[PDB]
Ligand binder design. Structure first.
Ligand SMILES: COC(=O)N[C@@](C)(c1ccc(F)cc1)c1cnc(N2CCN(c3ncnn4cc(-c5cnn(C)c5)cc34)CC2)nc1
Length: 294
């Protein structure tokens, strides 16, 4: 035991992140749920001493159990360990001296799923959404996930709803509440509500999460993207028949606007054998070549 994997959630909270609570002014709620809410806010003096900036602030309800408080702190420590990357919603600060507040970047265009549904009607393959945009988004998300995988981290809730868009058509992966550093055991074994239609079969049937199950979810994200924000497995409810069809190899067909090479990636992401799925590193190089040929 002279060498070990450093567990990022065991490391101390770095007080370089600490920011005064009184310098945040809370605005409109950006997301809400059982644990708490994410709210838009103006932070005075966060980056430059005399300037206010718009941030997103994640917070728990007062009623949350101390285990929920630990999970928010673990997320904070995971983001601190990961460091900065262009394609992830980056940590900006925290308030840990009343309730724990986690301050991240504010993405002005919101989640990609609603963005696609807004732009669906005016989409043209060739300020309109185009096929070039969709290729860039697929590429940027794969870069972000490749970065996560290189840090021995799995996200576990990859989907268009958890991809945010900000200035410059930059996509950022958000919501790291379920992310895990799996360096030690090569997978993660998880009773909350789960995103069944984005989950690999091994995650549904045996509660196993890996690099490869993140790649499955990325395939579903691609289908969301090139169908311009449609719900996956349309007209199929989550029931006994859904699980049986997935187990027996049923897969979604190519969305209307997906290039053949992109649906090829989707199919490999959805292989029943996790070993046969590609890595995010391989996906990035594939999409690179596709972009290079217009
Ligand atoms: C069981 O599930 C839970 O309880 N989870 C929640 C409720 C939770 C909350 C607190 C907590 F402690 C634990 C969990 C939760 C809720 N929401 C979110 N997301 C995180 C990323 N978001 C944004 N981040 C940065 N900028 N930004 C801009 C926009 C935007 C929208 N419209 N426009 C024009 C712009 C949106 C964002 C959106 C909300 N995450 C988690």
């Amino acid at each position: 035991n002279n060498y070990s994997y450093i567990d990022p959630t065991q490391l101390p909270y770095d007080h370089k992140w600490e920011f005064p609570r009184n310098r945040l002014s809370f605005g409109k709620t950006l997301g809400a749920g059982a644990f708490g809410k994410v709210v838009e806010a103006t932070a005075q003096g966060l980056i430059k001493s005399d300037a206010a900036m718009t941030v997103a602030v994640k917070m728990l309800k007062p009623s949350a159990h101390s285990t929920e408080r630990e999970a928010l702190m673990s997320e904070l420590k995971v983001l601190s360990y990961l460091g900065n990357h262009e394609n992830i919603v980056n940590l900006l600060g925290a308030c840990t001296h009343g309730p724990t507040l986690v301050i991240t970047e504010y993405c002005c265009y919101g989640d990609l799923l609603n963005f696609l549904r807004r732009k669906r009607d005016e989409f043209v393959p060739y300020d309109f959404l185009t096929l070039e945009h969709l290729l860039s988004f697929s590429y940027q998300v794969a870069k972000g996930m490749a970065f996560l995988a290189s840090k021995n981290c799995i996200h576990r809730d990859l989907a268009a709803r958890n991809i945010l868009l900000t200035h410059g058509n930059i996509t950022k992966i958000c919501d790291f509440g379920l992310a895990r550093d799996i360096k030690n055991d090569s997978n993660y074994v998880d009773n909350a509500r789960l995103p069944v239609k984005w989950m690999a079969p091994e995650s549904i049937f045996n509660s196993v999460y890996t690099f490869e199950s993140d790649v499955w979810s990325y395939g579903i994200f691609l289908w969301e993207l090139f169908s311009l924000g449609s719900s996956p497995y349309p007209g199929m409810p989550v029931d006994s028949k859904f699980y049986k069809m997935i187990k027996e190899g049923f897969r979604m067909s190519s969305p209307e606007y997906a290039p053949a090479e992109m649906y090829d990636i989707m199919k490999t992401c959805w292989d029943a054998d996790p070993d046969k799925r590609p890595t995010f590193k391989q996906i990035v190089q594939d999409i690179e070549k596709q972009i290079s040929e217009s």
